[PDB]
Amino acid sequence: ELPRNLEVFNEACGHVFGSSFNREDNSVISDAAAFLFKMHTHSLDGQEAKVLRASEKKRERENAKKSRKAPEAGMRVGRSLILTSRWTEYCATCVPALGSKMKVIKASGDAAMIQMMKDHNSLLRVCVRIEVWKARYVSLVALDERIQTLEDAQWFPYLSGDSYRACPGLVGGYFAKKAAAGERGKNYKKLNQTAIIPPPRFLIIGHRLQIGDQVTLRELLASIAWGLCDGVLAECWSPSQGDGSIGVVVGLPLQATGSCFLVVASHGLSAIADSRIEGTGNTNLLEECIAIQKQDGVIKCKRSGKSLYHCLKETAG
Amino acid sequence: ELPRNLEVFNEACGHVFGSSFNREDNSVISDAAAFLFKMHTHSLDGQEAKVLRASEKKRERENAKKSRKAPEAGMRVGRSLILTSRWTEYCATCVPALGSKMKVIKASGDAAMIQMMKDHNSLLRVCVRIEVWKARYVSLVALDERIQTLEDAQWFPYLSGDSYRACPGLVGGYFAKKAAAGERGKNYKKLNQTAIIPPPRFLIIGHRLQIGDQVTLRELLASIAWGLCDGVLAECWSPSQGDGSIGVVVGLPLQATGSCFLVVASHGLSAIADSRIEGTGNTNLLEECIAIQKQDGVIKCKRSGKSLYHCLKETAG
Amino acid sequence: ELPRNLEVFNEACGHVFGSSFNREDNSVISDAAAFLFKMHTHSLDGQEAKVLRASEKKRERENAKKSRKAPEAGMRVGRSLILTSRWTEYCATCVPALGSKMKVIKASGDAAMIQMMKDHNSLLRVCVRIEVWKARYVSLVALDERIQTLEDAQWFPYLSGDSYRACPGLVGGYFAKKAAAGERGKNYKKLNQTAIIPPPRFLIIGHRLQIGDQVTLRELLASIAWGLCDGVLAECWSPSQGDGSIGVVVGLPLQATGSCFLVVASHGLSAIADSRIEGTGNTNLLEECIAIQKQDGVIKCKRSGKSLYHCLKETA
Amino acid sequence: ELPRNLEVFNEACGHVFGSSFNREDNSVISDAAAFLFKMHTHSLDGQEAKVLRASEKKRERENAKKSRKAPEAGMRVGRSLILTSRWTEYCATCVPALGSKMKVIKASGDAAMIQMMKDHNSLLRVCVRIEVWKARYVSLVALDERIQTLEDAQWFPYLSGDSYRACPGLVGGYFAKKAAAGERGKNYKKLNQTAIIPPPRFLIIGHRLQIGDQVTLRELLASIAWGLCDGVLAECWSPSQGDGSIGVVVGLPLQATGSCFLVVASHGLSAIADSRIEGTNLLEECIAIQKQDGVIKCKRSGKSLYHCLKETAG
Amino acid sequence: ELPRNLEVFNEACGHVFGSSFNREDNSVISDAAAFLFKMHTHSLDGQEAKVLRASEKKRERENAKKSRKAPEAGMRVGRSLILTSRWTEYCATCVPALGSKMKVIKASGDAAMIQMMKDHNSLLRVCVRIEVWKARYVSLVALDERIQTLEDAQWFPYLSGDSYRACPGLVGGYFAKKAAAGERGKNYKKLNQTAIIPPPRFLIIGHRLQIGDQVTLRELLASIAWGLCDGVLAECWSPSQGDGSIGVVVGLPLQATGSCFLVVASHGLSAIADSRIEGTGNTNLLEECIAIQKQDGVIKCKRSGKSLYHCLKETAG
DNA sequence: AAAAAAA
DNA sequence: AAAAAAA
DNA sequence: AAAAAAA
DNA sequence: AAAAAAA
DNA sequence: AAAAAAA
């Protein structure tokens, strides 16, 4: 009924949070995913210290974390997430020991341990996807101070190293910048800043985002873009009968990933660094378009020239 | 009559300097505040050596400071500040011992000790505010050799770690740069380079700067801006009858909130550095205006396009 | 009937894949050539470890490869390639031993060994040519994430060291970059990025690509150019009667290896990047033309100003 | 009569060169200052090798220097400088021992040693000021092969580490580049590439350069600028009656040091990287020359001082 | 009659080639100089192997060179050069042993060895000057494939390491690139791409190139410029009576070396990255002139805006 | 917009 | 433009 | 355009 | 456009 | 758009 990743995530969240884990609230799912990600990276209190090559300051911080008592049952997480009494058992059972690697487990040959490690990897990937989607959802109506120029915005989201490792194609930030600056191997994944990510309530259920879905404007925009994206993407939504809060999806943007506008010299031609700019691109900027695929077909929509955050702020005035 | 902070500062300065501390001279007040900050930071000769995690060079420097004789009574400070014979008693009484922390004092429960620690913290904050104002006043006519570009000027004033700790929102420099670069938590405070600070002769009295105050051009500018702020802010001053040296404040600037107008490249659209300017192509910056709020109302004044330091230098030729 | 190289490749592919090796599918031929190149480079499981100067990590990887079981008969390769039970015999026989060099064999003087070494070199050259063509065919619709600027795009295709060594005149990548950075000896060869390469279904048969051949648009473009070449090259193709999928070639590009028109700064003058453009100063890059040779004659076609990849994406 | 620094320099030059040291020749004074600087930094032959943390190559070079015989009396220095037989005594006495530090001397408490160290420091400062002046004078007519772009020209003069330490505000080069690139403390000084330096024949006498003094065009330009400075500065010089070789100073440049044209963004304004650019023909600019009558703005010539000096001689 | 350098080169060439060495042919002199350079760098077959720090591949190559038989007397060199039976004696006697350094020879105190090393250095310098001149002469009628852009053309000629070491102010290539990129000591010498090099038939004789000399167009151009220099330089040549092939030099270019067009910011002025480009009015490049000094006087000749190679190619068609 | 590596 | 944390 | 630190 | 260093 | 060397 469900793939391995989604089933593992559902089981883990249900076990850790019991019945307090609502299965239809984006905020609840994002908070639960963040907590599970912290648990599975040994970021919670009372777990193994990360000291393999840590600096003395990092060693002190990890020692303080280890000394600190672990979270207790009944503790409130986020807004409406309450820990059960069994969460310690789950953390002890399903969490790989610090430093564990897939090669070591494979050498061991224990099928149960291999399955547990696969479940842990899938859970990390799912939680990082949910974390990226929540970062986009927050950034629609809350500017990040660190993002002041195009260069600063070029690496959104800014997530920890574990997030980058779990999903290098979606997660940006310092680690993505480091990977791009350094040597690029055959495994290099470029940052698909505007990759389509289903809403968490859809991601856990496995329902792929598509036309006809009943989704709020903010969550749809967080799914297909973020705050500093061109406002024209708002055209991918249409309020339902009686306005309300939930509308419908009318289409999806095209060219979401893989946009390269280079032309190399050949056969006596001249190299071009940008197809769009060549000629007089400054006057053609606001004349650009985006291809939106709808149920009927593809349509080109003129760019609004205004940030998504600014459009949402203005329409909310 | 006066808040706790100003009263504590007045008592401390009176005790240390007696009658030699003028209550109407900005330079004297700034020198006294700097000396008091040094005393409460254990930066004077003969005070506790900082060795908790000091490097061998730092350990040697602190040992040299400790071995050196402490300042004697009657020692000249700055220009017109003379230490009183009772300054040693005040230093011994009102200066918490090195390493003092509010948590430990609260655990002790001594009401007198808690009040003393609160007074010390208030004195630190007041002294740091006076230090920042004096840095602005100095930079109006005497640039800093460490400021060469906009990136360097983004961290003015350049003050020590203690000043940044006391007033993180007003004090820039190396520590502000470090804080901005690293992780930003809920307690992170952005550097307000041009935060309003009344002159020290007003700050100790608590008289908030407002329209109609009889202040000098340079001191007003240091109150609202610094050397590299655009010269248009000079419109906030007006010479009084007969010119002279003291005029009157006609208005104050308004700090605009944070609002980024970027539009990153997405789905084939070209990046926009600024939505407002890209469309019509009005790239000229000299047209920009500042909102000066006056007694009559708010007025948009066109920028001069020249640094405040340059304007002051040219008008003083 | 066929040259030595194509005959060697045909015999090798027939022996290794038997009847499962289709002779008219470009994807199948490309996969077979890739597998043969892997086999003759001792990169498969169970072959000699490359340790002559390997680093400890490289030594570990090669030891892991050697310890691993060799591919078994009937194993599925690519999509429609199945290994025959006699592939092990060919691998043992026709594959030169690791570290073998032509000088050593010539000193030995065994005519059969010399012929085997020559056949192996020809097989490497043919396999690498097919690999380069397949790289071009892939790049027409799926950009390489390692290409983001013109500097990086200058070194396409990005192939391994073996590919560069076998065919230095077609293969780019890190090794070609290193060769360019270092000394340029008399044996140095520049990367002819857009060198015409017949499709594998043509290369193995020896049928040189020319006008009138019934070839698909994508395969023709992969033959004469790659993803980031200008879209104007699409003019070399023309749909046949009834459209369908297979058309015909109407012309081929004329490789413009013209002499440099630079004038370096000297005696206080100013450097000129191009003496021709200096006069009129027509700074419009959309006016350039490419000389396509057709059956009737050569014609100058105006550049489209858009990447071949973008034109293909829009037309699809 | 004279400050400590100039008196110390005059005494040292008299002791080391006797009467052969001409007090009115810029080249001779510069060469004598360079020799004294080499002596007081322990660079001449026969002085202690520098090995504290030297690399094997540096250790070998300094061992070679130590083994090599010390300079002999009567040796020709520069062009018209001859060593005296007593120079060895001065080198042994007034030169601090290698590694001497003012803190150590102060801890010792010997007044004579403290005075000697102060004299050594003043001599180093004076010698490096003269060295920078001479570097400017040379660069007027003989370009440096190391200066090819404005980025390279930004660090003139290129002088040894001892020169940078003696006067970090004037000297440039690799050490100034390192100081600028790295962390800058409260002691940081920016490279004042056109700070006014009196000519050596004036510097040792202590006569501050001012309008009316009889100086040569080349030496005045060296005092106020160098080769790659905009040629308009030549307006500061006026030939005397009958041309000849010596003229007079009419005016001096202003804003020599401390020119910043930034405007940081504030109160919603936009940051301006350059006030001049936001106003843009470069050749229209002017430089403020202060004369006896008053300040006058002279239009920039747009041509490097070296080019103008070369063309005026052809 | 002749300086030490030219006398040494003449003696060495006569000893190694005897009467087969023509004293008026540029190709023959260039070939002889190249062969002597190969001999004096221990690059010929059967000479000392360079193994001090050579890589294993380099060690193999040098071992192969050492094992190979040395050149035999009577071998044909170039076109019209034949080795003499006494060349082995000269190679053994006048060639310093591999690794010989001037410091070691001076320490030994042997006057004869010091003189031999001086002769070796002078011969290296002369051979490298001739090699650079021949490189220019080749580039006039044969483009170098390695030169495709202005940056590539900036380092011509591309000569080996020994050539760069002997004459660093005339020889470019990888080693000049390395010297420019790395630290620049006081001894640093820039690459004078258009220095005046007398033709080999004049360089060995010591006759400095001057006005009125009977030199062919191609060899004059190779003397004063190279393939990708401005075509205007052809004005420095004039066919003699009856045309023929040999003409006469009517003038020489000025500003051959040491051309800097920088003005630095000082006293509030603005930095000029290039005086020519910044010149008042948009100076069209084809309007630029070169100063040719002639017997009568200097004349400004307008640039032809076309390469010397292309001018020669068109004039020969 | 599958899996295997992996401050 | 209040307090509590805290090179 | 004073003193104290100090490849 | 002299001499000494010295992939 | 023939062969020989050969991270």
Give the DSSP letter string of D252-289. EESS-S-----BB--TT---BS-TTT----GGG-EEEE
Is the Cβ of B317 closer than 8 Å to some Cβ of chain A? no
CA distance C186 to C163: 21
- What DSSP assignment string belongs to A199-253? -HHHHHHT----TT----HHHHHHHH--TTSBGGGGGGEEEETTEEEEEEE-EEE
Q: Do E149 and C262 touch (CB under 8 A)?
A: yes
> Which residues sit opposite B251 in a β-bridge?
B294
Q: Before B239, cis peptide (omega within 30)?
A: no
> Which residues sit opposite B307 in a β-bridge?
B230
A150: closest CA among B270, B257, B267? B270
Is the Cβ of A146 closer than 8 Å to some Cβ of chain B? yes
* Gap from E288 CA to chain C (nearest CA, Å): 6
Q: Do D269 and B288 touch (CB under 8 A)?
A: yes
Task: Tell whether D124 and D41 lie within a shared domain.
Answer: yes
Q: Which residue of C has its CA nearest to A269?
A: C288
Is the Cβ of E256 closer than 8 Å to some Cβ of chain D? no
Q: Which run of H or E residues covers position B276?
A: helix B275-278
**Closest residue to J3 measured CA to C1′:** C118
* Gap from E149 CA to chain D (nearest CA, Å): 20
Is the Cβ of A266 closer than 8 Å to some Cβ of chain C? yes
Q: Do A153 and B264 touch (CB under 8 A)?
A: yes
B122 CB below 7 A from strand G atoms: yes
Which residue type does B113 have? M
Q: Do A259 and B265 touch (CB under 8 A)?
A: yes
Stated length of chain A: 317
Residue recorded with tokens 């200052």: D33
CA distance C24 to A250: 44
Nucleotides of J under 7 A from a protein CB: 1, 3-7
Among E107, E141, E175, identify where a domain stops: E141
Q: Do A230 and B269 touch (CB under 8 A)?
A: yes
Task: Tell whether D130 and D238 lie within a shared domain.
Answer: no
**C interface mutation test: which of E156, E277, E307, E309 has the most C CBs within 10 A?**
E307
Q: Which residue in D190, D263, D266 is closest to B306 by CB distance?
A: D263
Which nucleotide lies nearest residue B194, CA to C1'?
G1
| D and E touching (3 or more beta-carbon pairs closer than 8 Å) | yes
* Gap from C273 CA to chain E (nearest CA, Å): 7
Task: Tell whether D127 and D217 lie within a shared domain.
Answer: no
* Gap from A175 CA to chain B (nearest CA, Å): 14
Task: Tell whether E113 and E234 lie within a shared domain.
Answer: no
Residue pairs between chains D and E whose CB atoms are closer than 8 Å = 88
E43 CB below 7 A from strand I atoms: no
Residue A17, Cα to own-chain centre: how many angstroms? 22
Among A117, A139, A161, identify where a domain stops: A139
Task: Tell whether B162 and B224 lie within a shared domain.
Answer: no
In a domain? residue B212? no
- What DSSP assignment string belongs to chain E? ---HHHHHHHHHHHHHHGGG--SS-HHHHHHHHHHHHHHHTT-STTS----SS--HHHHHHHHHHHHSPPPPTT-EETTTEE--TTHHHHHHHHSPPTT--HHHHHHHT-HHHHHHHHHHHHHHHHHHHHHHHHHHHHHTTS--TT--SHHHHTT-SB--HHHHHH-TTT-BSHHHHHHHHS---TT-----TT-----HHHHTTT----TT---BHHHHHHHH--TTSBGGGGGGEEEETTEEEEEEE-EEES--S-----BB--TT---BS-HHHHSSS---GGG-EEEEEESS-EEEEE---SBHHHHHHHHT-
In a domain? residue A165? no
Is the Cβ of A306 closer than 8 Å to some Cβ of chain B? yes
| D and C touching (3 or more beta-carbon pairs closer than 8 Å) | no
Q: Do A268 and C285 touch (CB under 8 A)?
A: no
DSSP code for D229: B
Give the three-class secondary structure for B97: coil
Q: Do C263 and E193 touch (CB under 8 A)?
A: no
Task: Tell whether E130 and E233 lie within a shared domain.
Answer: no
Q: Which run of H or E residues covers position C94?
A: helix C87-94
Burial class (CB in 10 A: 0-12, 13-18, 19+), C241: exposed
In a domain? residue D61? yes
Among D142, D172, D194, identify where a domain stops: D142
Task: Tell whether C145 and C286 lie within a shared domain.
Answer: no
Q: Which residue of C has its CA nearest to E225?
A: C266
* Gap from C146 CA to chain A (nearest CA, Å): 7
Contact A217, A300 (CB under 8 A): no
Q: Do B270 and A290 touch (CB under 8 A)?
A: no
Tokens of A45: 């209190």
Helices and strands (H, E) in chain B, number of each type: 13, 7
Taking the alpha carbons at both ends of chain A, their separation in whole angstroms is 44
* Gap from C268 CA to chain A (nearest CA, Å): 29
Resolution of this structure in Å: 3.5
The spacing between the Cα labelled CA in E261 and the C1' in G4, in angstroms, equals 63
DSSP code for A296: S
C6: closest CA among C287, C301, C205? C205
Is the Cβ of D172 closer than 8 Å to some Cβ of chain E? no
Is the Cβ of E282 closer than 8 Å to some Cβ of chain C? no
Residue recorded with tokens 């879905």: A213
In a domain? residue C296? yes
Which residues contact residue C312 at a Cβ distance below 8 angstroms, ignoring those fewer than 6 apart?
A: C140, C141, C218, C221
DSSP code for B218: H
**Closest residue to F4 measured CA to C1′:** A102
CA distance A267 to B257: 54
Contact E192, E155 (CB under 8 A): no
Q: Domain tally for chain C?
A: 2
For chain A, the chains sharing at least 3 beta-carbon pairs closer than 8 angstroms are: B, C
Task: Tell whether C21 and C150 lie within a shared domain.
Answer: yes
In a domain? residue A127? yes
Residue recorded with tokens 């920009």: B288
Q: Which residue of A has its CA nearest to B282?
A: A282
Kindly list the distances between the CA atom of residue A260 and the CA atoms of B266, C143, C306, D196, in Å, as whole numbers in the listed order.
Answer: 12, 8, 11, 55
Is the Cβ of A262 closer than 8 Å to some Cβ of chain C? yes
DSSP code for B158: B
Q: Which residues from A are below 8 Å from C291, CB to CB? A: 267-268
User: Using CB atoms and an 8 Å cut-off, which of residues 152-171 of chain B contact chain D?
Assistant: 153-154, 156, 158
* Gap from B23 CA to chain A (nearest CA, Å): 41
In a domain? residue B263? yes
Is the Cβ of D193 closer than 8 Å to some Cβ of chain E? yes
CA distance B303 to B232: 5
Residue recorded with tokens 């000057």: E129
Tokens of C78: 């690519």
* Gap from E19 CA to chain C (nearest CA, Å): 32
**D interface mutation test: which of B159, B306, B308, B312 has the most D CBs within 10 A?**
B306
Task: Spell out the long-range contacts of C82-86 with Cβ–Cβ below 8 A and sequence spacing 24 or more.
Answer: C82/C17, C82/C18, C82/C20, C83/C16, C83/C17, C84/C15, C84/C16, C84/C17, C84/C18, C84/C20, C86/C15, C86/C18
Task: Tell whether D23 and D136 lie within a shared domain.
Answer: yes
Q: Before B71, cis peptide (omega within 30)?
A: no
In a domain? residue E15? yes
Q: Which residue of B has its CA nearest to D290?
A: B317
Which residue type does D5 have? N
Q: Do E228 and C263 touch (CB under 8 A)?
A: yes
Task: Tell whether B111 and B228 lie within a shared domain.
Answer: no
Torsion of CA D94, D100, D101, D105, to 10 degrees: -70
Which nucleotide lies nearest residue E58, CA to C1'?
I7
Which nucleotide lies nearest residue B114, CA to C1'?
G4
Residue D250, Cα to own-chain centre: how many angstroms? 23
Q: Which residues from B are below 8 Å from A309, CB to CB? A: 260
For this PDB entry, the determination method is cryo-EM
> Which residues sit opposite A158 in a β-bridge?
A172
Q: Do B290 and D267 touch (CB under 8 A)?
A: yes
- In window 46-105 of B, residues with CB < 7 A from nucleic chain G are 54-55, 58, 101-103
Q: Do D260 and B149 touch (CB under 8 A)?
A: no
Task: Tell whether C175 and C267 lie within a shared domain.
Answer: no
In a domain? residue A191? no
Task: Tell whether A125 and A30 lie within a shared domain.
Answer: yes
**Closest residue to I3 measured CA to C1′:** E118
Burial D271-284 (b: 16+ CB within 10 A, else e): ebeebbebeeebbe
What's the domain range around C124? 4-209
Is the Cβ of C290 closer than 8 Å to some Cβ of chain A? yes
Q: Which residues from C are below 8 Å from A291, CB to CB? A: none
Residue recorded with tokens 């009176």: B14
